[PDB]
A paper describes a structure:
Here we report that the cryo-EM structures of α-synuclein filaments from the brains of individuals with PD, PDD and DLB are made of a single protofilament (Lewy fold) that is markedly different from the protofilaments of MSA. Still, for each case, a minority of filaments (~25%) was twisted, allowing their structure determination by helical reconstruction. α-Synuclein filaments from PD, PDD and DLB are identical and comprise a single protofilament. We termed the structure of the ordered core of these filaments “Lewy fold”. The Lewy fold is formed by residues 31-100 of α-synuclein, which arrange as nine β-strands (β1-9) in a three-layered structure. The first two layers are corrugated, with the first comprising β1-5 and the second β6-8. Two additional, partial layers are made by densities (islands) that are not connected to the rest of the ordered core. Island A packs against β5; island B packs against the N-terminal half of β9.
α-Synuclein is a 140-amino acid protein, over half of which (residues 7-87) consists of seven imperfect repeats, which are lipid-binding domains. They partially overlap with a hydrophobic region (residues 61-95), also known as the non-β-amyloid component (NAC), which is necessary for the assembly of recombinant α-synuclein into filaments. Neuropathologically, it is characterised by the presence of abundant filamentous inclusions of α-synuclein in the form of Lewy bodies and Lewy neurites in some brain cells, including dopaminergic nerve cells of the substantia nigra.
Numbering used by the authors:
A (entry chain C), B (entry chain C), C (entry chain C): 1 to 7
D (entry chain A), E (entry chain A), F (entry chain A): 31 to 100
Amino acid sequence: XXXXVXX
Amino acid sequence: XXXXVXX
Amino acid sequence: XXXXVXX
Amino acid sequence: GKTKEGVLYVGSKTKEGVVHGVATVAEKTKEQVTNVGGAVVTGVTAVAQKTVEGAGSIAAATGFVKKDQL
Amino acid sequence: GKTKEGVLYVGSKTKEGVVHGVATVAEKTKEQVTNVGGAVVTGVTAVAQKTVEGAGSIAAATGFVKKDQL
Amino acid sequence: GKTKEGVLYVGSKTKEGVVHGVATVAEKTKEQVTNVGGAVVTGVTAVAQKTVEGAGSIAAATGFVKKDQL
């Protein structure tokens, strides 16, 4: 479950 | 379940 | 479960 | 000479917000709530009352029931 | 000459916020709540009352019931 | 000449906040709450009452019940 946000 | 957001 | 945020 | 008398509001009011990134993962989970600037309203009873030189009566009830027989 | 008499508000009001990044993971979890600037309202009874030279009566009830037989 | 009489507010009010990064992980966990600037309201009874030269009565009840038979 790799939730990777990157703004 | 790899939710990857990238703005 | 690798939640990686990066603004 | 404003009057608000006998008025109700339920839910949400938003003026001029921003929300960039809201990512969510639920896996093998019974219940999961992700709320951002929102109202998640469940199983509420709300009564507001003003009486003047009068008689006022209210009876209010809410029954919320959820069963999950597995 | 404003009056708010017999008024109710339930939920959320937002004016001009920001929320950049809200990431969440629930795995093998019974219950999980992620709330940001939000209202998560569950199982509430709320009564406001003003009487003047009068009779006022209220009966309010909330029943919230959740069963999960596995 | 403002009056608020018989009014209720339940939930959240936000004006002009910021929230940058809110990351959360729940793994094999019964209950988990992450709250930021938010209201998570559960199982509350709230009564406000003003009477003047009058009779006022309120009966309020909340029952919150949660069972998880595994």
